[PDB]
C-alpha cells in the first residue's frame, strides 16, 4: 500500500522547514516512528532541505532531472518510484506539495499532523475529499516547553 505523511497548518498550508514557523520535535518523532524501516519517496526540494539521507529508510527522490547525489536513489516517474520500493507492505510518500499531489490518487492511507498555526504560504497539501476518507486515529497535543504549537496526529484510510 501507498501512504502519504505530512504536517499541515490551517487551510492545508505546508512547506519546507525553513519556511514554516513551527518547531515540533514530537511531530518529527511521529514522522520517524511511522517512516522508519520503510522506503520514503520525496521531491527534490525536500531532499535539498534534509541535506542527507533519512537514516533507516530507503531514500528515493522523484525528479524529472538527473540525480546529483549517489547516496540515494533517483527516479523520473511515479510508476518508477513505486517499482524502486519493491515488495514492501507500505510505501511512505513524504512530499512536498507537488509530490503529494502526484501520489494521492494511488494512496490508501494518510498520516496528517494538523498544526494549530495560521501560516502565509503558497504550497498546500492536495485537496483530498474528506468524505471519501475515514478517520481511524486522532490524537491531540497541547504546545509545551519543547513544541511551539498545539498539534493533532491523524490517520485516515481511503473508504
Amino acid at each position, epitope marked *: 500500500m501507498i501512504s502519504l505523511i505530512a504536517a499541515l497548518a490551517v487551510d492545508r498550508v505546508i512547506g519546507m522547514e525553513n*519556511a514554516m514557523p513551527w518547531n515540533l520535535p514530537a511531530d518529527l518523532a511521529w514522522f520517524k516512528r511511522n517512516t522508519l524501516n520503510k522506503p520514503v519517496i520525496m521531491g527534490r526540494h525536500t531532499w535539498e532541505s534534509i541535506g542527507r539521507p533519512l537514516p533507516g529508510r530507503k531514500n528515493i527522490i522523484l525528479s524529472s532531472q538527473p540525480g546529483t547525489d549517489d547516496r540515494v536513489t533517483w527516479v523520473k516517474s511515479v510508476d518508477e518510484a513505486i517499482a524502486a520500493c519493491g515488495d514492501v507492505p507500505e510505501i511512505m510518500v513524504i512530499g512536498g506539495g507537488r509530490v503529494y499531489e502526484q501520489f494521492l490518487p494511488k494512496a490508501q492511507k494518510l498520516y496528517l499532523t494538523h498544526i494549530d498555526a495560521e501560516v502565509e504560504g503558497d504550497t498546500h497539501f492536495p485537496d483530498y475529499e474528506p468524505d471519501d476518507w475515514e478517520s481511524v486515529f486522532s490524537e491531540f497535543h497541547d504546545a509545551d516547553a519543547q513544541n511551539s504549537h498545539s498539534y493533532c496526529f491523524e490517520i485516515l484510510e481511503r473508504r
Partner: nanobody
Amino acid sequence: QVQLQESGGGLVQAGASLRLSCAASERLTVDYAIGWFRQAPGKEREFVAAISWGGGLTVYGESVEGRFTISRDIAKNTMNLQMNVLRPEDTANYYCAASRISYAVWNTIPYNKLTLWGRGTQVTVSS
C-alpha cells in the same frame, strides 16, 4: 548567483560585544536559511549560528549558546549576529553562508554542502 557580503569584524577586548552583518545581493526565498561559520588558524571550520529565512527560527553552536543572537530582516534582505561577552577563543575569520538546507541541520552538516559563501570577516578578541 546570490552573493553574501560580511561586515562588522574588528578587534575588541575580552568581555566586549561585536555585531556582524551579512547582506545578500538578491532576495532570499522563504525556503532558505542563512548563518555563520567560523574558522581560526589551524582549526577546522565550525558552525556558529543559523536562522531560517521564512520562519525566523534559530539554532546555535554549543560554544556560543546564550552569548550570541542571530536575527534577520526580510525587507532589508540582511542578517545580523550580535556577539556578547566575547572570549579570546572566539577569535576567527567569520563566514556568512546561505542554503536551502534546513537551518536545524546546520550544526552537523558538512560545511561544503552549503554553496553560497561570503569571503569572511576577521574577529579578534584580545586578553
